[PDB]
Amino acid sequence: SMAQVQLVESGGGLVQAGGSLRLSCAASGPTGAMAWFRQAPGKEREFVGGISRSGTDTYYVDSVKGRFTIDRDNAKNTVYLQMNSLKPEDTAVYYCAARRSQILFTSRTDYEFWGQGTQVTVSGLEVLF
Amino acid sequence: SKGEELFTGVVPILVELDGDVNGHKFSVSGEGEGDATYGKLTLKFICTTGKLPVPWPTLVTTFVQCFARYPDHMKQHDFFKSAMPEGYVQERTIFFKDDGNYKTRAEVKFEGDTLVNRIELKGIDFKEDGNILGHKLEYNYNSHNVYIMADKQKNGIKVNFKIRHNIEDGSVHLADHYQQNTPIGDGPVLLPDNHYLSTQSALSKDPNEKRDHMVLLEFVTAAGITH
Ligand code: NA
Ligand code: NA
Ligand code: NA
Ligand code: NA
Ligand code: NA
Ligand code: NA
Ligand code: NA
Ligand code: NA
Ligand code: NA
Ligand code: NA
Ligand code: NA
């Protein structure tokens, strides 16, 4: 039965509008549904996409459907978010999240475990710096 | 008792339903907890296959009467807990007046420390623009009395009641429930004297849940035997 776990995010970073970035997250042990949330500056944390324990149920918000993909590895206790065709509005701090239950609910309040947040920055500037 | 003892505190619940209404297929997963000390059930469900093709309120009765509060003087009449942890099979036919019917078979049993309700549902003969497939039910629920009698034949109980679904035009659509429960295990169970469960429910929405969903609160107390 599922227990207390810690979540360690990696990946993300800086990219030019239209590019690609991959996020990853590693749980200290087995866990249930896993999801990615994001907090753009001066806005509320929001659900992005997620995946049930078994992987047979995924769900994505409409604004990323078709561009973002999630999958998980229950052997390694990981999940990843592959983000294609990124847009400046995708800029945010992204959080990995998990819950003991297998079910892919999508409310922040349904998730017990949280990563610390990983910055993703998508530049609409033609010249980044 | 032994079955009784599994319910002295808060018990987590899982619910899983595979459904087919007029060939229209869907799946629901839910979770929550029950506290038979208060007679309280709290559950949240999502439809994992997209949009639910029938109104959420029509599935409330299908989605764990072992969480009823039985008063102490009535504890010998609590079939549901007495079958635990091996559990019971709960079968219904539900007749929607002038419309189709649901037929359900569920197993209710402990899987570990969790009380799990796993359901198969088949619905037929619905009017494609009836109140059900037309989604004309209000998102709400009323109070009902659930009538229970022993069925000594089958070592279980037989249950019947009629649900009142409010329709958005002011009318009310009755769903005639016929139910039988039989123990899964072989241990002895309590076969009750006639009595009933007073049930009350309230439906809501989680404003942050993006998927099609239902939040259900049920309060259930047994009654109908004196002293
Ligand atoms: Na695992
Ligand atoms: Na699943
Ligand atoms: Na990964
Ligand atoms: Na959790
Ligand atoms: Na429908
Ligand atoms: Na039902
Ligand atoms: Na119902
Ligand atoms: Na009892
Ligand atoms: Na059931
Ligand atoms: Na109402
Ligand atoms: Na009423």
CATH code assigned at A92: 2.60.40.10
Does A129 reside within a domain?
no
> Which residue of B lies nearest to A110 if distances are taken between CA atoms?
B209
Using CA atoms, how far apart are residues B178 and A108, in angstroms rounded to an integer?
39
What's the domain range around B49?
Answer: 2-223
Domain count of chain A? 1
Under 8 Å between Cβ of B64 and B84 = no
Chain A residues within an 8 Å CB radius of B112: 1
Closest CA to B110 of B83, B90, B92: B83
- CATH number of the domain encompassing residue B12: 2.40.155.10
CA distances from B220 to B10, B87, B197 (A): 15, 19, 6
CA distances from B189 to B5, B9, B11, B42 (A): 14, 21, 21, 26
Using CA atoms, how far apart are residues B211 and B226, in angstroms rounded to an integer?
46
Q: Could you please report the per-residue DSSP string of B122-163?
A: EEE---TTSTTTTT-B-S----EEEEEEEEGGGTEEEEEEEE
CA distances from B11 to A89, A108, B60, B129 (A): 43, 23, 19, 40
Overall residue count recorded for chain A in this entry:
129
**CB-side exposure of B14: number of CA atoms within 13 Å?**
14
Residue B95: how many other CB atoms lie within 10 Å: 16
Using CA atoms, how far apart are residues B191 and B14, in angstroms rounded to an integer?
26
- Provide the experimental method for this PDB entry: X-ray
Using CA atoms, how far apart are residues B31 and B114, in angstroms rounded to an integer?
10
CB contact under 8 A, A108 and B206: no
State the virtual CA torsion across A57, B61, B198, B74 in degrees, nearest 10. Answer: -80
Does A45 reside within a domain?
yes
Side chain identity at residue B141, one-letter code: Y
Beta bridge partners of B202: B217
Q: Which two tokens stand for residue A22?
A: 């991959």
Does A13 reside within a domain?
yes
Those residues with Cβ within 8 angstroms of residue A8's Cβ, 6 or more apart along the chain or in another chain = A25, A26, A27, A28, A115
Q: How far apart are the first and last CA of chain B?
A: 20
State the virtual CA torsion across B82, B118, B36, B159 in degrees, nearest 10. Answer: -60
What's the domain range around A18?
Answer: 7-123
Closest CA to B227 of B77, B44, B15, B7: B77
Using CA atoms, how far apart are residues B101 and B125, in angstroms rounded to an integer?
7
Those residues with Cβ within 8 angstroms of residue B151's Cβ, 6 or more apart along the chain or in another chain = B157, B158, B180
Q: What residues of chain A, 21 to 80, have a C-beta less than 8 Å from chain B?
A: 47, 52, 57, 59, 61
Number of H helices, E strands in chain A: 0, 11
Domain count of chain B? 1
Mutation pick from B205, B211, B212, B215 vs chain A, by most beta carbons of A within 10 Å, is: B211
Chain A residues within an 8 Å CB radius of B45: none
Q: What is the resolution of this structure in A?
A: 1.8
CB contact under 8 A, A105 and B30: no
CA distances from B58 to A119, B125, B166 (A): 45, 15, 11
3-state DSSP assignment of residue B67: helix
The arrangement of strands across the sheet holding A21-27 comes to A7-11, A21-27, A78-83, A68-73
Q: Is B62 left (phi over 0), alpha (psi -120 to 50) or beta?
A: alpha
Q: Could you please report the per-residue DSSP string of A75-127?
A: TTTEEEEEE-S--GGG-EEEEEEE-SSSS----GGG--EE---EEEEEE-SSS
Minimum distance, in Å, between the CA of residue B209 and any CA atom of chain A: 5
Give the number of A-B residue pairs with CB atoms closer than 8 Å: 34
Using CA atoms, how far apart are residues A59 and A22, in angstroms rounded to an integer?
18
Largest CA distance in chain A: 51
Phi and psi at residue B61, to the nearest 5°: -65, -30
Q: CA quadruple B145, B147, B148, B154: dihedral positive or negative? A: negative
Does A61 reside within a domain?
yes
Beta strand A118-123 pairing with A13-16: parallel
Phi and psi at residue A107, to the nearest 5°: -80, 135
Q: CA quadruple A82, A88, A91, A97: dihedral positive or negative? A: negative
